Design a protein around this ligand. Structure first.
Ligand SMILES: *[C@H](CNC(=O)c1cc2c([nH]c1=O)CCC2)CC(=O)OC
Ligand code: NA
Ligand SMILES: [Zn+2]
Ligand SMILES: [Zn+2]
Ligand SMILES: [Zn+2]
Ligand SMILES: [Zn+2]
Length: 199
């Protein structure tokens, strides 16, 4: 099937029981293991913790079912435009397909995706093509923060460093942007349990 089997060949391995599913993620991040009933993010393998069961030291949503994702998890990068994901890859000289080397990715009755496969998406649908691009991004450990606007750096600083940044008096936007980026890059690492394929 081309890239459909590339997505399906390296599927989803339960962090708890290590059972291997040969499935694509598309845009669905909530995965529930049949064998051990573990619930985890298929993009970063972090667990979804139930109410009052989150070890995250500064979690503010402790009393509800939720999960925490690194900034390069498909949970976030699925919402980028394909163009922005491609820019991140091109800036790092990473080859990506726009043409094949309905969507034929096989999902669960076990049936095919079958959604529209627009031109430039290598014979896949919007969601699976973005998953393909994000798998290249993850395989090369590329940092999406390098394409953030100031507003995304502010949100990231809050989410991952728990401080609300503010521009300094007389600090032009370029400097503010570079200060937030420099800080986030130094302190917050990329996903530590993201399943990164070979490059
Ligand atoms: C999105 C929706 N869930 C699943 O696709 C899913 C499929 C299977 C199982 N659990 C799940 O949560 C057990 C056997 C098949 C999550 C996702 O990553 O899609 C693959
Ligand atoms: Na995290
Ligand atoms: Zn399991
Ligand atoms: Zn995630
Ligand atoms: Zn939490
Ligand atoms: Zn598809």
């Amino acid at each position: 099937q081309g890239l459909a089997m590339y997505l399906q060949e390296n599927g989803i391995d339960c962090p708890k029981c290590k059972f291997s599913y040969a499935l694509a993620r598309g845009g669905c991040m909530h995965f529930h293991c049949t064998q051990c009933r573990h619930q985890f993010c298929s993009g970063c393998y972090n667990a979804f913790y139930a109410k009052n069961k989150c070890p995250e030291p500064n979690c503010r949503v402790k009393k509800s079912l939720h999960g925490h994702h690194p900034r390069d998890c498909l949970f976030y990068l699925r919402d980028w435009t394909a163009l922005r994901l491609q820019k991140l890859l091109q800036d790092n000289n990473v080859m990506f397909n726009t043409e094949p080397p309905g969507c034929r990715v096989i999902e669960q009755r076990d049936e095919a995706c079958g959604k529209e496969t627009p031109a430039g998406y290598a014979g896949l649908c919007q969601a699976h093509y973005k998953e393909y691009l994000v798998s290249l991004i993850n395989a090369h450990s590329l940092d999406p923060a390098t394409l953030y606007e100031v507003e995304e750096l502010e949100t990231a600083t809050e989410r991952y460093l728990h401080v609300r940044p503010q521009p300094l008096a007389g600090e032009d936007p370029p400097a503010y942007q570079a200060r937030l980026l420099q800080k986030l890059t130094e302190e917050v690492p990329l996903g530590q349990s993201i399943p990164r394929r070979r490059k």
